[PDB]
Structures are given as C-alpha cells and as structure tokens.
C-alpha cells in the first residue's frame, strides 16, 4: 500500500516504529512529521494513538532505507471514542498508519464537554481539526504565553480575549460577563479592542491614599535606611490625616488605621512631618506651638493643627524629632512636585472616590466593557512596579472581598477577573531587588492564592527566564510561541511538565503564530496554529527611517521648546 | 471596468460556470477562451453562439499558446506562469512513470532539443546510487523523419546519456519490458519511446501512477483520458526547457 | 577645567540655546551632533552625560505633547550614541554613576515611544 | 559535474550530506564553509535550503575520501521565493549543491 | 615628472586600452614594452614605428626578459616578482595536467637541471597513498642533444625519481597512454615528454584541464593558444628553480 509501517519495539511510554515501504511520498511530508498522529493496531476498531517524538531516515549503498519513527502512545481509541493514557500496551508487531481526521478530532473532542470547549486555534499539521481547550481550566489556572519578539505573542493574547468576549450564552443580547484587565506597556491592544475602555496616564487617576502600608512606605520611605523614627511619624501623620478627613460614623472613625483605605491629603502629611522636624519643647518635655488661634501643646487633640504650615515652634530645647526628618521631607516633596507622578499624586486624586476607582479598574462605571486596557506606556519606570502592585492588589482584594460577601450569602463569586501582564518580567523579576519587590508580592499572592478568589494571570513575556520561578510555576497553562534564546529555551524546559520530544527543539523552528499549548486545559500538549486576528494588536510606533528620509523639519522645534516652558 | 478590473470579472464568471479551481481558471480556461475570440475574428458572421458549442470548444484538455499575453507579460513572465500553474514540483517528487511527449519538426536543430532532454533528465529522474526506488523519464518524439529521429538518438548515446527504447538489438520486436526495467535501472538515464504505437503498448505494462507532460507547437495526439495529462502549446522548442 | 559647566557662559546661556546646541537646531543645522567629551574631567563626566541625556529625552517627551495637540505627522526622532557605555551605565550601584545610569535607563525603558 | 553531494540521513532538524565527488576544489573552500548555505532538492523548481553546521573530510590509505557535511534545514524556496519554516521533510537521498546567489539573496531580502 | 609619478602612468595607457588586470599589465605588458624600446633605440637603422605595430609587438604570449630589471631590484627581488605574478598558488592544488617546458642547452650543467626537476616534482605533485586524485607534472626539454638528454634521464633513474616517457620498452612506438596512467600513478613521480612531436600527441589524450609553463632563455616553443600559458624568459637555468 501507500504506507507500510509497524512497531518494532515498545517501552513504558515509548514506541519504535519502522517504516518499511513508503510508496506514496506525501504521507511522509505531512502525516509522518514530529507531532503527527499514528494509529497503532491490527484491527480497525480498537487502537492506540501516538505522537511522533523523533525520526531518522538513514539511506545507504545497497541495503534498504532505514526509516525509524520514535513515537509515544498518547492514549487509546475504542470505536470512535478516545481514552487518554499510556497504560495500555501494544505487543509488537502492530501495523502503523497515519491517524484519520476523525481520530485526531476525537482526541480533543472527547476529554472536554461540549459546553466546556474554548476554541481559539487549530492544529498546525492538520488545519481541518480545531483544538479546543477546557475553558474553565484554561482561565481558572493561570496562563503563561512566552516567546521571542515577533513570534505573535500579543496577537495570541488578543485572540484569546476576543474569543472570550465574543462568546455568549444563548437567549440574551448585549455584553457578556467576562472581565479582563490588560497592563499595556506598548499600547497595542487599543486597536485590537476598539469598543473598550482605555486608560493612559492622562486620564487614569490612581488615588495615592488607596496604597496600602507596604506600597506607601515603598513610594516614599527608604527600605535600605530602615529608620524607625521616620517610619513612625509617617504612619501617625497619615493615620491622623485619614481620621480628620473622615465624614462618617464615629464607630468607623475609631478603627481607621494607617493601612485602611481612606482619603488623606499628602500635602498636609508633608507639612506635619516638616513641622515635627522643627519641634521645640519647654522644660516639661511637651512640644509647644503658636498659631493663629493661639498657643497650643502637641498632643492627640492638637496634633491636627500641625497639618497647617502656618505654625511656629515655641520651646527652649530642641524637640524629640527635631533635626531628624530633614532628609525625609526633602524626599517626600520631591515625589509630589514631579509632574510625571501627577496621575497618582496630583489634585485629581483628591476628588476621586474609592468606589469610583474600583469601577474604573474593572470597567463597571458609566461605560461598561469586558476589556479594560491600562496604557502604562506613559508611566515612569520607577513607579511601574508601584502602579502594577496597586492595581493587582486592588483587584485581588476586591476578588477576596467578593468571596467573603458571597459566603455570608452562601453563593459563589459572581464575577471572575483575568489580568494580562504584558512584559511580565519587569514587574516580577527573578532578582530579589527591592525596587520591584512590591510588584512581585502582588503578583505572588494572585499566582498562589488568586485561584480561589476569581483573580488570575495571563503572563505574556518575551524573556520567561527573567520571570520568577515561583510565579511561573503557579501558572498551569503554557503557550510557547517561539523561543530562540537558549537560556529561555532551557528555563522553559525545566518549567514544562513531562512532554519529552515535543518541547525539545520544536520551539526554535515554530513559525509565526504557531504555538505549543500544554496544561490541564488541553488533553495532550500539541503544536497548534493560532487563528489569524482580523482585528490585530497594532502599536503605533515611530518609523525612524520614514521620518529620517523626509525633509529636515524646521517649524516643529520652536513649538516643542515653548510648550516645555508653558508646562 | 478597467483593464485589470474586467480581467477579475471574467475569471469569477468562469469559476462560477465550472465550479473548478482558480489555478487553471486563469491560466488554462481564460487563455483558451481568448484564443477562440481571435479565431472567429477572421470570419465574424456569428455574435450569438450557444454555450453548448463555444464553451465546449474552449474546455479542451489543451492549453493553447496566446501571443498577446506572450507579448504583454513577456517571454520570461509567460513561461513563469506556466511553471507555477501546471508543472508543480515538491521537495519529494515521487517515483511515477512520467511521460514527456515533445513535438519535433525538421526546422528545429538537435542541439536545442538536447538541452531540453538534459533539462528533463536532470529534473525528473533520481538515479542516485543510494536510492531504492529510482525513476527515469519517458521521452516520446513525433512528427519527424526517422533520419532526424535516429540522428538525435546517436549523439545522445555518445555523450554518456544511456537510454533504452525497447529494441535491444537489430531485428528485435518492441519488447516493452526493457522500458519498465529501464525505469528502475540506475544506469539508464531516461526512456525513449520511438513512436505512437509503442506508447500505448507501454501504458498497459505499468501499474504505478502515470503522468503525461505533452508539449507541442502544431499538432497533439489523442492520448487516453484516464491518466493525468498536462498539455502546453509553445511557440518553439526553446520554451520547453524554461517550463519543465 | 569646569568653565564649560560653571563658567560665566553657563549663567548667560538660555534654555532654548542649550537644546539648539545639543540637537544642532541652531544657526548651522546638522544631522549629527558630536559631543567631544574627551576634555571633560572624569569626575564630572557622568554629570554631563546625565544632564544631556535627560535634556534630550525630555525634548522627546514634550515632542509627543505637541503632537497630540496639533495632530501633525511631522516628528523629530533622536538616536543617542553612547561610546564606552559600560562606564556611564555600570552594573555597580555606586553613587558615582547612578546619575548617568538613571538617565540612560529612562531612555532605554521609555524613550521608544518618545 | 562540479560537486556531487547527496543527503544520506534526515533528522527532525538535522541533515547529513555526503560529498561523493569534488572535481572542483574551489567549491569546497568558499561554498562549503562552516556557515554556508546548501540547497537540497531533486529539481531546480522547489528546494530546501540548509545552512552547514559541521563537516569532516577523512582520507584513508586505500579507501575513498569520506567528505561528510552536517546541515540544518532553515527553510524552503519555491520559484525563487524563500519561506522560513520548520521540519519540512526531504526524503533521502537528495542531490545537494551550494545555493545560488538569488536563493541566498532571497533569504534576507524577502523578509 | 618625478620618478614616483611617471611609472604609475606608464601602465595606464596599456591598461585602459586592453582592459586587462593588474598582474598582466605591470609585469607582462610594461616589461615587454621596456625591452621593445631599447632594441629599437640602440639600433641605428630605424626609429619610426606605428603605434598599432607597437601594440602587436609587445602583446605576444611571452614574458620577455628585461636586463634593467635585474640590477635595479636584484636577483632575489626579480624572481619574487615573477613568482607571485603568473605562478600564483593556492592552499589546495587541483589535479591538473601541468606541462613544464624547460629549455635545455649544452652550456647548462646536468646538476642545475636536476634540482629544477626536484623543485618541480616536489611542488606540482601529490603522490600520497591516501590521494584519490593523484597528480604529477609533465616535463618537456628542448634544444639539447639526445646524448645529453638521455644522460639526464639515466641519472634521474638511479636516485629513485621514477618517471615515464611513453616508451615502456626498447623498440616501442610512442604510446601516449603510458603518460596518462603515470599521471594518476602514485609510484611515477613525473612524466618526461621527449620532444615536441610527443608533446602534441599527449595533449589530445588529456581531457582534464591542463596548463603549460614554459621557461626558456633564447628559443621558445609554440604551444597552441587555447591552453593556459606561462612563457617566462630568464637569464639562466638556475633562475627556474626559484620561480616555480
Ligand atoms: N496566529 C497568527 N497567524 C499568522 N500570523 C500571526 C499570528 N499571530 C501573529 N502573527 C504575526 O506575527 C507578528 C508578530 O506579532 P506578535 O506575535 O503579536 O509580536 P510579539 O510576539 O513581539 O508581541 C505580527 O505582525 C502578526 O502579523
Ligand atoms: Mg507584544
């Protein structure tokens, strides 16, 4: 016949197959490649199916051509139904044929229910078979999409999210329940999702008072200094400022702490700390001050007066914290006065609400969308770790507090939330440096614990080796576009469970848009072809050659300088 | 309805009529329809012709040579569109019994036609000393004198291009089994079918897949229709080398 | 030795004239501006590199603030060449080079879009 | 001919080429280098390009020269248009010659 | 013009006229023109010469000896100049049928001819046992008496420089195929063509690429011009050892 192959040797998870004739050559081209499927049986009703790990076609002078195929049994097919597992044993010899289209279809269409299928790709070797994944297990366990630059990582991220948005239950018209937050460093997904809310630095107002105890100390204090007096005055200035601005029930007022998410004014906190740097005491160790209303002594009732700058110290001896906060105050107002931090520390954070901030992040406000794109291209890099950690913790804790409402009402969580981390190694590096410490633990607690609170990850990174192994291991779904860096290839090999012969060196040779999906969502790890984005993630970037080719511009330079003076 | 816009419309209406593929709707069906348009330009008494006659005549198994796209595309561009449309190759061409029927006149010299034979032999044969299924092309020449046909065979043998024709000695009958044995012979570079009568006798003695690549200028033969045929009309023999 | 940074000309020079000098948008336009910093003292060399790299990046940062307001295709792309880049941006976290490290790392991380 | 090379073994990403006859020495010096490009085909229409990775030329006292070339199939050309790919199969034996100028140009110019 | 200016314009008239390369202009066409000007100036009969006559007078397939280019740079520098100009070498030397035509005259000692033969033998032969393509140079001598010629061959045989000459036994006719197998024979160090009539017969029996190197003093034999030619005149026979 066209193909005459049979199994010559078996092993626990391993078959050696000798192709004897190979009469028709196009069988070997597309049906005998690495990752193809083989039917291993003697009858036409019960068979095993086998992925192809390796092959070798030796040809010599006089002896026959030695086509040996290295295969591993992926499961068992019985009368049109596929059963996973390499436990079943083929006693050699067994006739080997390429698997038919119905057999490859039944591999992926049997382990997943009809309502649990999430199709966004097709098999690379056989276009006519689509590859669904367990969409519950796809998103509930964290996803890591890795690959080199130009491999199609961002198109694959968007095509997963467009299929998540476009899919709906029958009987309703309108938006679906899905909630996706994208951290956009390159501003690509704005075009991919036109009817979605996009928040860049100019419009996104992140309140600084929503920063917790760790993040507020990370933004302003120095970890390396570790000054207990500077830390203590920073906490008590902020805690008092949260109290005096509270407009509510006095019972809620008493439980307000440094970490409680209430509005405080950062200008008043600087004034109080600058005031306590100028402390003076009398001969009774009590700091005495004079302001417009009169003389007063620093105590719990009168400590709110120090928020006003227009006070003068009146004491014979230097105060307790006198001459100890001068470096702290200079650092404190260096962050405030910088215009790049105006979205997080400006006047817009005064008028924003805690509820309004949550509605902004998951797009629950006036304009509702499944996809929220955070264009953090304009965020300065020193606060990229601060801002990612704030939004991730604001989403995890919302996901945690969603569950604690629902357990009192004895319900499950109504909304799940996916967060997409483009360029994920910048937030969460392998390095233990303190400058990216706060963004690591925010993504750590979602990776380790967010599974139970409806908060999950989509780690999209070019250099997976730089991602921390602790966050990368908590991911269970793994999509590899194309890895050409050998350090990246070896790290992912150590991070991919089992799957020998498939992840080995197929990843360098993968074409654009061609990916390897593995995890509990997919039945077997397979090379798939991610379907084309009709609405692609285009990033508007500067084409230097096209701008350098044209005329030297002269009218533009005068406009840049004068607005710099204006701003 | 510009020059390119009208060209796109006639392809689609041809594809709607036959429900066939697009590679031969433009390069095989469109070219034969244009040839019959100029063929009825000499005597133009008929403007309404039924579709059972005009469309039937252009839907032959033959690809006629069009002079206008030969001039509009050019010599290199026209032969390039006959590469990608009919003679499609792969990296792993299979050992099939390929038959090459080439049309011979007395005006064509031997040296040009030799250059087509070494083009056919080097491209359509794998006589490798390591291979297990070697294949060699079958060559048929027709329309010529026997003196010119025997002259071409003599100079092919002198330059170490060993062939067989089913006549292993003088006075031999046409034994066809030398051609099939010469097909799988590593030391026989190609087969040489002498005339039409040996072509049909050879076809019944081969069981593997047979393909026929006819290339003609004036006349073409009525070869049987079950085997795949690929017929190109060319202007001259020098165009066959850049096609195969 | 520090007359270029701390002389009488530094007081008299305006902010606009500095960006015409570093970019060559002055009286004689040039595609390439070569800053010959060989004569710069080594103890202030990172200060001069960080000042210029900040000024060039901030020019590109405010380039985009014009471009959304006017909605104009005309753009000024700048490439900076750092010969001996290991000493302006070292692996060591010493304070002698963190000024030039921070200016280059801002360009390396944010300067693509500006 | 000038060079008679031939594929003798095929792996998923590795090609072994045996050079049987080398009548022109100049092909070995320039066109059979460490990083040179080879075309692997039985016809001049569609070819599989491979870059060399290693080679070994061993000579013995009465035996023929054993010139082996180790290559890797980076891609494929059809009618002068190069397509970068992975695990495209060339069934051995396949005639191997150094890639032409237009084929090597089309690797870098097409992208 | 200074001495560092007019020499590098002296070649530019010939170089642009003939569209030649660097090595065959300064060392092959300039040097013949210098010698062709002195012998027409030292002669007290004629001075006028047409420029077309001067074109064909120096464009012969010969590298004429120049006396003034022997003390200006020296014995060592002139032969070094002639070494890298026409006898350029590579790392791998191709198995070519190289013919060496050396002018033997009666004033030349047999010993000085002998070390020229070992210099040619050790340079233009690879008679290793592991060669699958062995090669060995062809030696031709002319202008000498046969008694002095046969004396040279007898001394070459005693010290184990085995050669063939196309005469395998006494009374044999010249069989040129003994020179052909000796080219591929590892045990035959070189071939010894006796006369010019033996040389033209050997050329028709060689199908591989062949080259001719002639080194003479006064008289030069005429090789057919389609072959690669190197015809270099020298002061004496001892220069030939240092150029090949
Ligand atoms: N599924 C696909 N099919 C075909 N082409 C694709 C596919 N995905 C991406 N591409 C192409 O690959 C290119 C790389 O895009 P992408 O992978 O998003 O870049 P990056 O990996 O650097 O984020 C895109 O220009 C796109 O045209
Ligand atoms: Mg991207």
Pocket test for ligand 1, best of A119, A513, A515, A534 (most atoms within 8 A of CB): A513
Helix (H) or strand (E) holding D68: strand D66-78
Distance separating alpha carbons of residues C18 and C25, to the nearest angstrom? 10
Residues paired with residue B142 on neighbouring β-strands, in sequence order: B103
Token pair recorded at residue E53: 């006559």
Token pair recorded at residue B239: 């165009």
Distance separating alpha carbons of residues B138 and B121, to the nearest angstrom? 9
- Interface probe with D: pick from E91, E92, E93, E134, most Cβ of D within 10 Å: E92
Nearest-neighbour CA in chain E from D33: distance (Å): 15
E strands in A347-445: 371-375, 417-422
Residue A459 CA neighbour count, 13 Å, CB half: 34
Distance separating alpha carbons of residues A554 and A535, to the nearest angstrom? 37
Where do runs of H (alpha helix) occur along chain D?
A: 25-26, 101-109
Q: Do A565 and C15 make contact, defined as CB atoms within 8 angstroms?
A: yes
Q: Do D45 and B128 make contact, defined as CB atoms within 8 angstroms?
A: no
What's the start-to-end Cα distance of chain C, in Å?
A: 34
Q: Is residue A56 less than 8 Å (CB to CB) from chain D?
A: yes
The shortest CB-CB distance from A61 to any of B93, B94, B130 is to: B130
Resolution in Å, one decimal, please. Answer: 2.8
Contacts of A483 in chain D (CB under 8 A): none
Nearest-neighbour CA in chain D from E55: distance (Å): 35
Peptide bond into A93 cis (omega under 30): yes
Contacts of A510 in chain D (CB under 8 A): 86
Contact A18/A6 with Cβ under 8 angstroms? yes
Contact A198/A190 with Cβ under 8 angstroms? yes
Helix (H) or strand (E) holding B33: helix B30-39
**Total count of residues recorded for chain B:** 244
Tell me how the structure was determined.
cryo-EM
Where do runs of H (alpha helix) occur along A167-212?
A: 189-192
Residues paired with residue B229 on neighbouring β-strands, in sequence order: B212
Token pair recorded at residue C1: 């030795």
3 state DSSP class of A221: coil
Token pair recorded at residue E100: 């060496």
Token pair recorded at residue D53: 């990775």
Q: Do A56 and D89 make contact, defined as CB atoms within 8 angstroms?
A: no
Q: Is residue A223 less than 8 Å (CB to CB) from chain C?
A: no
Atom of ligand 1 nearest to the CA of A157: 18
Distance separating alpha carbons of residues B129 and C50, to the nearest angstrom? 69
Q: Do E131 and D25 make contact, defined as CB atoms within 8 angstroms?
A: no
Q: Do C74 and A557 make contact, defined as CB atoms within 8 angstroms?
A: no
Angle at A481 between CA A477 and CA A482, to 5 degrees: 130
The bound ligand whose nearest atom lies closest to the alpha carbon of A422 is 2
Distance separating alpha carbons of residues A459 and E81, to the nearest angstrom? 70
Contacts of A58 in chain D (CB under 8 A): 8-9, 92
Q: Which residue reads 């329940």 in tokens?
A: A177
What's the start-to-end Cα distance of chain E, in Å?
A: 37
3 state DSSP class of C91: coil
Token pair recorded at residue C39: 């004569």
Residue E243 CA neighbour count, 13 Å, CB half: 27
Contact A507/A487 with Cβ under 8 angstroms? no
Dihedral sign computed on CA atoms, order D22, D24, D26, D31: negative
Q: Which residue reads 């491979």 in tokens?
A: D50
Contacts of D65 in chain E (CB under 8 A): 132
**Which letter does DSSP use for residue B29 in this model?**
I
Residues paired with residue A17 on neighbouring β-strands, in sequence order: A7, A69
Distance separating alpha carbons of residues A278 and A293, to the nearest angstrom? 20
Output the CA A149–ligand 2 centroid distance in Å: 7
Output the CA A156–ligand 2 centroid distance in Å: 10
Contact E187/E171 with Cβ under 8 angstroms? no
Helix (H) or strand (E) holding A79: none
Residue A157 CA neighbour count, 13 Å, CB half: 34
Among candidates A107, A102, A133, which has minimal Cα distance to A119? Answer: A133
Contact A370/A180 with Cβ under 8 angstroms? yes
Angle at E143 between CA E142 and CA E148, to 5 degrees: 90
- CB neighbours of C98 closer than 8 A, spacing ≥ 6? none
Distance separating alpha carbons of residues B58 and B51, to the nearest angstrom? 11
- Interface probe with B: pick from A23, A30, A32, A33, most Cβ of B within 10 Å: A23
3 state DSSP class of E135: strand
**Which letter does DSSP use for residue A368 in this model?**
B
The bound ligand whose nearest atom lies closest to the alpha carbon of A127 is 1
Assess whether chains D and B touch, using the rule of 3 or more C-beta pairs within 8 angstroms. yes
C-alpha to C-alpha distances, A296 to A272, A300, E146, nearest whole angstrom: 15, 12, 137
Ligand 1 neighbour A149 (Cβ under 6 A): yes
Among candidates A233, A237, A236, A231, which has minimal Cα distance to A217? Answer: A231
Token pair recorded at residue E172: 């044999």
- CA-nearest residue for atom 16, ligand 1, is A152
> In which order are the strands placed within the sheet that holds E229-233?
E163-164, E190-193, E138-142, E97-103, E210-216, E229-233
The bound ligand whose nearest atom lies closest to the alpha carbon of A146 is 1
Contacts of C65 in chain A (CB under 8 A): 563, 567
Q: Do D9 and A510 make contact, defined as CB atoms within 8 angstroms?
A: no
Neighbours of chain E (3+ CB pairs under 8 A): D
3 state DSSP class of D1: coil
Q: Do C66 and A381 make contact, defined as CB atoms within 8 angstroms?
A: no
**Which letter does DSSP use for residue A314 in this model?**
-
Reduce the secondary structure of B53-116 to three states and give it as a string.
CHHHHHCCCEECCCHHHHHHCCHHHHHHHHHCCCCCCCCCCCCCEEEEEEECCCCCCHHHHHHH
C-alpha to C-alpha distances, E89 to A231, A475, E97, nearest whole angstrom: 81, 64, 15
Q: Do B94 and A60 make contact, defined as CB atoms within 8 angstroms?
A: no
Distance separating alpha carbons of residues B30 and B10, to the nearest angstrom? 8
Contacts of B130 in chain A (CB under 8 A): 59-61
Distance separating alpha carbons of residues E147 and E166, to the nearest angstrom? 18
Distance separating alpha carbons of residues A463 and A226, to the nearest angstrom? 33
Pocket test for ligand 1, best of A161, A512, A532, A536 (most atoms within 8 A of CB): A512
Q: How many CB atoms lie within 10 A of CB D37?
A: 19
Contact C60/C111 with Cβ under 8 angstroms? yes
Assess whether chains E and A touch, using the rule of 3 or more C-beta pairs within 8 angstroms. no
Distance separating alpha carbons of residues A51 and A524, to the nearest angstrom? 9
Among candidates E131, E129, E121, which has minimal Cα distance to E92? Answer: E131
Q: What b/e readout covers C88-97, taking b as 16+ CB neighbours within 10 angstroms?
A: bbeeeeeeeb
Ligand 1 neighbour A426 (Cβ under 6 A): no
3 state DSSP class of A183: strand
Contact A457/A143 with Cβ under 8 angstroms? yes
Contact E203/E225 with Cβ under 8 angstroms? no
Contact D32/A77 with Cβ under 8 angstroms? no
Helix (H) or strand (E) holding A157: helix A153-166
Contact A18/A57 with Cβ under 8 angstroms? no
Distance separating alpha carbons of residues C29 and C39, to the nearest angstrom? 24
Residues paired with residue E212 on neighbouring β-strands, in sequence order: E99, E229
Token pair recorded at residue B104: 């011979």
* Burial (Cβ within 10 Å: 0-12, 13-18, ≥19) of residue E32: buried
C-alpha to C-alpha distances, C50 to C13, C24, C106, D76, E55, nearest whole angstrom: 19, 19, 10, 49, 70
Among candidates A222, A319, A238, A233, which has minimal Cα distance to A280? Answer: A319
Q: Do A560 and C16 make contact, defined as CB atoms within 8 angstroms?
A: no
Residue E202 CA neighbour count, 13 Å, CB half: 33
- CB neighbours of E97 closer than 8 A, spacing ≥ 6? E135, E138, E183, E206, E208, E209, E210, E211
The shortest CB-CB distance from D61 to any of E91, E92, E129 is to: E129
Residues paired with residue E135 on neighbouring β-strands, in sequence order: E126
Q: Is residue A213 less than 8 Å (CB to CB) from chain D?
A: no
Distance separating alpha carbons of residues A22 and A2, to the nearest angstrom? 6
Residue A167 backbone dihedrals phi, psi, to 5 degrees: -75, 140
Token pair recorded at residue E82: 């002639």
Which residues 2-41 in chain A show a CB within 8 A of chain B? 24-26, 28-29
Q: Do A564 and C109 make contact, defined as CB atoms within 8 angstroms?
A: no
Contact A530/A514 with Cβ under 8 angstroms? yes
Helix (H) or strand (E) holding E142: strand E138-142
Contact A40/A96 with Cβ under 8 angstroms? yes
- CB neighbours of A57 closer than 8 A, spacing ≥ 6? A65, A66, A67, A68, D9, D10, D91, D92
Q: Do B94 and A26 make contact, defined as CB atoms within 8 angstroms?
A: yes
Residue A179 backbone dihedrals phi, psi, to 5 degrees: -135, 115
3 state DSSP class of A47: strand
Ligand 1 neighbour A15 (Cβ under 6 A): no
Residue by residue, DSSP assigns E52-116 as HHHHHHH-SS-B---SHHHHSS-HHHHHHHHHHHHS---SSPP--EEEEEEE--TTS-HHHHHHH
Q: Which residue reads 């350090």 in tokens?
A: A487
Ligand 1 neighbour A511 (Cβ under 6 A): no
Residue by residue, DSSP assigns E154-209 as HHHHHTT--EE-S--STT----THHHHHHHH-SS--EEEE-SHHHHHHHHHT--S-
C-alpha to C-alpha distances, B33 to A11, A367, B8, B39, B70, nearest whole angstrom: 62, 59, 15, 10, 15
Where do runs of H (alpha helix) occur along A54-134?
A: 101-108
Contacts of A542 in chain C (CB under 8 A): 75, 77, 112-113
Residue E160 backbone dihedrals phi, psi, to 5 degrees: 65, 40
Output the CA C109–ligand 2 centroid distance in Å: 15
E strands in A334-432: 371-375, 417-422
Output the CA A462–ligand 1 centroid distance in Å: 13
**Which letter does DSSP use for residue B130 in this model?**
T
């Amino acid at each position: 016949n066209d193909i005459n192959a049979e199994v010559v040797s078996v092993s626990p998870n391993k078959l050696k197959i000798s192709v004897d004739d190979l009469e028709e050559f196009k069988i070997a081209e597309e049906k005998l490649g690495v990752g193809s499927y083989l039917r291993v049986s003697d009858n036409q009703d019960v068979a095993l199916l086998a992925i192809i790990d390796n092959f070798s076609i030796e040809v010599k002078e006089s002896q026959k051509q030695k086509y040996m195929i290295e295969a591993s049994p992926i499961g068992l097919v019985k009368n049109g139904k596929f059963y996973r597992g390499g436990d079943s044993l083929a006693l050699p010899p067994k006739k080997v044929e390429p698997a038919k289209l119905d057999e490859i279809i039944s591999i992926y269409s049997d382990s997943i229910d009809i309502n649990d299928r999430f199709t966004f790709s097709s098999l690379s070797l056989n276009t006519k078979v689509s590859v669904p994944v367990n969409g519950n297990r796809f998103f509930n366990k964290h996803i890591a999409i890795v690959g080199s630059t130009g491999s199609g990582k961002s198109h694959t991220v968007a095509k997963i999210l467009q299929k998540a948005v476009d899919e709906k239950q029958e009987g309703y018209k309108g938006l679906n329940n899905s909630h996706i937050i994208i951290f956009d460093i390159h501003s690509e997904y704005e075009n991919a999702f036109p009817n979605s809310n996009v928040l860049n630095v100019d419009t996104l107002t992140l309140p600084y008072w929503l920063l917790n105890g760790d993040e507020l100390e990370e933004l302003f204090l120095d970890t390396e200094a570790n000054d207990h007096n500077q830390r203590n005055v920073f906490r008590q200035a902020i805690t008092l400022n949260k109290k005096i601005h509270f407009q509510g029930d006095p019972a809620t007022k008493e439980i307000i702490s440094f970490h409680s998410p209430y509005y405080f004014d950062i200008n008043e906190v600087i004034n109080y700390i600058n005031n306590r740097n100028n402390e003076r005491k009398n001969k009774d160790n009590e700091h005495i001050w004079s302001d417009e209303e009169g003389n007063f002594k620093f105590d719990n009732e009168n400590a709110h007066r120090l928020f006003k700058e227009n006070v003068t110290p009146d004491g014979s001896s230097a105060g307790a914290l006198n001459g100890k906060l001068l470096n702290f105050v200079d650092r404190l107002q260096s962050k405030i006065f910088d215009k790049r931090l105006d979205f997080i520390l400006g006047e817009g954070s005064k008028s924003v609400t805690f509820k309004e901030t949550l509605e902004t992040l998951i797009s629950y406000g006036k304009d509702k969308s499944n996809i929220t794109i955070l264009d953090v291209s304009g965020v300065p890099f020193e606060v990229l770790s601060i801002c990612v950690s704030l939004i991730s913790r604001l989403i995890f804790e919302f996901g945690y507090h969603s569950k604690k409402i629902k357990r009192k009402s004895n319900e499950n969580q109504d909304i799940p939330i996916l967060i997409v981390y483009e360029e994920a190694h910048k937030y969460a590096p392998k390095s233990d440096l303190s400058k990216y410490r706060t963004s690591k633990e925010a993504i750590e607690r979602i990776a380790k614990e967010g599974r139970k609170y409806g908060v999950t990850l989509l780690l999209a990174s070019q250099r997976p080796s730089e991602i921390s192994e602790t966050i990368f291991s908590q991911c269970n779904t793994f999509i590899s576009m194309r890895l050409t860096n050998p350090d990246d290839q070896n790290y992912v090999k150590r991070l991919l469970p089992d799957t020998v012969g498939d992840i080995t060196n197929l990843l360098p040779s993968l074409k654009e848009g061609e990916a390897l999906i593995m995890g509990d969502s997919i039945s077997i790890p397979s090379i798939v072809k991610i379907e084309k984005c009709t609405i692609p993630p285009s990033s508007i970037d500067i084409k230097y050659l096209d701008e350098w080719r044209k005329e030297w511009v002269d009218s533009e330079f005068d406009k840049i300088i004068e607005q710099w003076s204006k701003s | 309805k510009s020059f390119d816009d009208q060209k796109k419309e006639t392809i689609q209406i041809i594809k709607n009529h036959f429900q066939c593929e697009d590679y031969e709707a433009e390069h095989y069906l469109y070219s034969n329809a244009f040839r019959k348009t100029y063929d009825i330009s000499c005597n133009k008494k008929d403007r309404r012709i039924k579709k059972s006659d005009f469309v039937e005549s252009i839907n032959k198994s033959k690809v006629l040579f069009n002079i206008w796209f030969y001039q509009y595309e050019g010599r290199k561009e026209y032969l390039r569109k006959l590469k990608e449309s009919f003679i499609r190759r792969s990296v792993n061409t299979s050992p099939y019994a390929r038959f090459f029927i080439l049309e011979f006149q007395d005006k064509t010299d031997i040296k040009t036609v030799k250059d087509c034979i070494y083009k056919i032999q080097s491209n359509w044969s794998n006589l490798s000393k390591r291979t297990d299924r070697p294949y060699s092309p079958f060559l048929l020449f027709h329309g010529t004198s026997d003196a010119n046909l025997y002259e071409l065979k003599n100079q092919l043998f002198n330059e170490d291009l060993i062939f067989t024709d089913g006549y292993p000695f003088k006075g031999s009958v046409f034994t066809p089994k030398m051609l099939i044995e010469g097909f799988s012979n590593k030391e026989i570079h190609f087969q040489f079918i002498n005339d039409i009568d040996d072509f049909n006798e050879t076809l019944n003695s081969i069981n593997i897949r047979k393909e026929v690549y006819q290339f003609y200028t004036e006349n073409c033969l009525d070869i049987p229709s079950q085997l795949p045929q690929v017929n190109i009309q060319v202007k001259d023999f020098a165009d066959i080398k850049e096609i195969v």
